[PDB]
Design a protein around this nucleic acid. Sequence first.
RNA 1: ACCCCUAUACCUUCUGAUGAAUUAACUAGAAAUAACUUUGCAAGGAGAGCCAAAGCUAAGACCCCCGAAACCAGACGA
RNA 2: GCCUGGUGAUAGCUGGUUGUCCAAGAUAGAAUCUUAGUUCAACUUUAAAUUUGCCCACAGAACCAAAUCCCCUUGUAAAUUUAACUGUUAGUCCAAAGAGGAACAGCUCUUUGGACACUAGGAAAAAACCUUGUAGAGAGAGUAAAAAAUUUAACA
RNA 3: UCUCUUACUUUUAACCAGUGAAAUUGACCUGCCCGUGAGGCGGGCAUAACACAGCAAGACGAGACCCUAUGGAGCUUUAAUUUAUUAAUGCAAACACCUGCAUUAAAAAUUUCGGUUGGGGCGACCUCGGAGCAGAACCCAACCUCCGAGCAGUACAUGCUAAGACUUCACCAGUCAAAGCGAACCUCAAUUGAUCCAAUAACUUGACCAACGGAACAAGUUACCCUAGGGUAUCUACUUUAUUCCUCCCUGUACGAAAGGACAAGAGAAAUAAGG
Lengths: 109, 246, 99, 120
Amino acid sequence: KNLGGKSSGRRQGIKKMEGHYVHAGNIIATQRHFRWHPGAHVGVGKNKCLYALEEGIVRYTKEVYVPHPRNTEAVDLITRLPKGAVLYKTFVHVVPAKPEGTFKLVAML
Amino acid sequence: RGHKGERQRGTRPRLGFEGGQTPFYIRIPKYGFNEGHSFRRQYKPLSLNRLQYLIDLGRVDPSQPIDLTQLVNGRGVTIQPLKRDYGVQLVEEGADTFTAKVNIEVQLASELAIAAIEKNGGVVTTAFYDPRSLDIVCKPVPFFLRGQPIPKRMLPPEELVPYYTDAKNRGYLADPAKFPEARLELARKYGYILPDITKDELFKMLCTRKDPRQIFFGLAPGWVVNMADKKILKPTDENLLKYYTS
Amino acid sequence: VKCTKARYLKKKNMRTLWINRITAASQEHGLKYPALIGNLVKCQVELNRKVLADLAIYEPKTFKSLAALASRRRHEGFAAALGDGKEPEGIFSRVVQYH
Amino acid sequence: KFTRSRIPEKVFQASPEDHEKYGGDPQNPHKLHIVTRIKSTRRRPYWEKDIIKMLGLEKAHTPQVHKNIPSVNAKLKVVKHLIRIKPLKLPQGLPAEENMSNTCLKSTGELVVQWHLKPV
RNA sequence: ACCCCUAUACCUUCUGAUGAAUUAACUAGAAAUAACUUUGCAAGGAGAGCCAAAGCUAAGACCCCCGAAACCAGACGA
RNA sequence: GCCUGGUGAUAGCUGGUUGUCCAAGAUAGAAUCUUAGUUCAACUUUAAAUUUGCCCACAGAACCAAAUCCCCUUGUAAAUUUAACUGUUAGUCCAAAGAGGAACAGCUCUUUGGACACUAGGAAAAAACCUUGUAGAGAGAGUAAAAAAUUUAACA
RNA sequence: UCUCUUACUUUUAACCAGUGAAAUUGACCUGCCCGUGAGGCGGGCAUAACACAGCAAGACGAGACCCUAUGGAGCUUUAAUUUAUUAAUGCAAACACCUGCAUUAAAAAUUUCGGUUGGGGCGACCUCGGAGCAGAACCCAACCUCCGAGCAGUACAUGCUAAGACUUCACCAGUCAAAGCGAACCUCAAUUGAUCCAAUAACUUGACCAACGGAACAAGUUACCCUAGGGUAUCUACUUUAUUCCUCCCUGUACGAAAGGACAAGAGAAAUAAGG
Ligand SMILES: [Mg+2]
Ligand SMILES: [Mg+2]
Ligand SMILES: [Mg+2]
Ligand SMILES: [Mg+2]
Ligand SMILES: [Mg+2]
Ligand SMILES: [Mg+2]
Ligand SMILES: [Mg+2]
Ligand SMILES: [Mg+2]
Ligand SMILES: [Mg+2]
Ligand SMILES: [Mg+2]
Ligand SMILES: [Mg+2]
Ligand SMILES: [Mg+2]
Ligand SMILES: [Mg+2]
Ligand SMILES: [Mg+2]
Ligand SMILES: [Mg+2]
Ligand SMILES: [Mg+2]
Ligand SMILES: [Mg+2]
Ligand SMILES: [Mg+2]
Ligand SMILES: [Mg+2]
């Protein structure tokens, strides 16, 4: 009497591991709950998927988690902590490769 | 054939059958990409690069009018009236580096191609041809073995009458009183001083058009070309002359 | 198919035939087959089984002297590996170095 | 599940007992290995089959020279059960262009650069 | 010649029972869209129609045998 | 009913498919009135174009075991793309991690890896265990795997 | 018929003479025991060759039973689709029959009766999502273990466009998205359905098509089912290798202590088997 459960794998996880060159708009990793958070130059979709906002190299770090004050779930999770207790998460960053443009000589007026 | 199945027996199903799920070529909505394909008109391009090329190699004589027969007999353009080509369209490719004084009769022409011809002292006009008429124009010699009198070419349909009656695109049914305004306007737009065709010696050649309802140049509808003993039989009955000179 | 798989068995059965004949002929002189072959290798006499079987049948004095050379070498192996330490090597125990 | 096997590093750390056993010096080690395949890649995983093809050991009992560098040592650690490794020792020098043709690798592991066929 | 030693008939169907006494004769791969190879000519090719942003023309090279119960039409039969 | 015709009916099913020699070549799946079949994919094959492929080191991949991904060096020689198509798939067993069953089955269902549908030697015979692969002749040689070991109970 | 069979005659038989089939048949130089997975393979054993007559243990040889085919046929219907055929009505045509158009009946006719399944059936199920199996990138089955879904709510820029990506192992579908123009200053996991066709001026809308990649609409059954499939002796071997019951005696002694009560060996009588 166990019907259902025939759903397939979502094929989620990391698409660009650390060190990988990444162009703008590449999906870095799709998750189902926030396993990785967006860091520098990384955006988030409605599906909690991390994509890239610049061209560069993906890096994963461990950072202090300080949520938005209007996020009453995580903020209520803060205030229960003891006085030294600091939350960390793993973040994903894109270190941007190129300069965003050069000055070039155009005309000798 | 492999092992004994349906592909060894010889009875694999038709092309497109996906074994029972609804096939690729049927899961997809009908959209009218090809809806009226065989009634759309087609026009073979003739670039000015191509036409300069034909004039340089002696294949098209620019000291005569360039009708569609002269582009076929020089084998510059292959046009097929079945497969519903309605003739040639001039194409602006090679407008710079087009150095020829010419008189072309081309069924469509872009503004920049008219500008490139009319800069050099040329004349463009856009004529119309029925499929019947176009078919007699391209290959005239297998028409004069058909025994029929020369027919009269029909006027455009209602879609194309506003095309061929405009002086901006040099219609053959337009005013010869609105042409200097249009030649003057292109000469102002594309920055060349408009030469007057009236001065030079080719002017009598650069003025000749055949009127509507005339397929060939020096001939008239209703004539029967006798290729064999090199004659032209002309009708003199009044009813035929009312019908052919209509 | 039998005719081509029998080439392997021709070679094999000749060799066991030679080991039977060398075994028999060396048992005539008290040696056993492993003793003879081992202690002739150890004298750098690199005769093979075909030749030893043919000497056993057709030249039994050469075969007797080969059995004497192999049992002498066998005893020097015993006496050498009994009185252990720095000593003079056996006479037939010496090897010829090639460079 | 049968998987690829990591081997810990304590396995590849010699003891002075082992320097007494084999003929090695931890200071000034050897440059070149001689590797020989002495076991089949059949009934072995496909990764070991590959490493045997990379090291150039498709034929058994045929010696191959390698560098004693950690990359080649990593590949050798994967297939160390199929091969035999000995140091290439060189009693005389490495062969010059004069002695290039007249060499012979002996069984001992040494590579002699003058190979006559006369007795001493 | 045998004795010695080695040697689990063939086809087909399965991951690993079928059919065949034997001989002779008969008895089962048919299509040139596209691609490829080789020529011709080449912004054109083709002996009209057709194709053409290096193409077009020509050729070569690819697609089995036997076997139901049936259904229908018209006859012949008490 | 039987005969002739349609009729070479149709058959995803059974059976059969004829010279030589060489080469490359075996196990993901998804749909389906579908599980005796097909289509796409995967794998396979040829031709072509190009440039990397494989092995991999640090660093790196989440909160609520074995390992893998990623990956420069290095060791190697392949890979991807383009063109054109066929064929194959309930695999079996062994080792390992498990599920169902009786911690039965030469039982059923997944995963990783071997081997077998490719050779030879061994294990009695022997698809799947061990040794071993690339092809010929030799009346040469060195080897690999490879032979089951056990025998008992006095008592103050 | 049987205990329990016996004798004889005929036929058959067997031999001699004439005449002379058939089913069968891969090739055979066609042994036993154990083992393997058995005339043939392994280990043992056996072993001159050859007819003729027998025997029937083995070799070699229909009728059932189950399943499958998007294979047939028949039967019953309140399966589906018809009413061409009859019979009635009704309306037109015509001045009752006939013709035309509807409608109701009978008689039939055409076609169908999905799938999963430790063979099959009942039961249960068929699509989508979460968790375990499957501990750490991705993927991973089961008539495996447990939860759920087929919506609701808010907003009306839930506008238009567009680099780059992910992707349920194909395709189809799905997802994410910077910049831009225009403006302000979506939550939830699943929460769903192709094409054709309809409806609509248009924008759009249309299935528990849930058998959820969906045939535009077709049930039960056949022990009458049917078809295609799947699960007269040739050879070997063989054909002349004394028990029991009862009686009696010893003895009603041994032994026991009384009750009790032997053996053995002997005589008997029986019965069976074996041989005459
Ligand atoms: Mg699941
Ligand atoms: Mg699944
Ligand atoms: Mg040998
Ligand atoms: Mg054959
Ligand atoms: Mg009668
Ligand atoms: Mg057929
Ligand atoms: Mg079929
Ligand atoms: Mg090969
Ligand atoms: Mg369906
Ligand atoms: Mg089928
Ligand atoms: Mg890399
Ligand atoms: Mg007779
Ligand atoms: Mg048996
Ligand atoms: Mg047999
Ligand atoms: Mg007999
Ligand atoms: Mg059918
Ligand atoms: Mg995919
Ligand atoms: Mg269905
Ligand atoms: Mg379905």
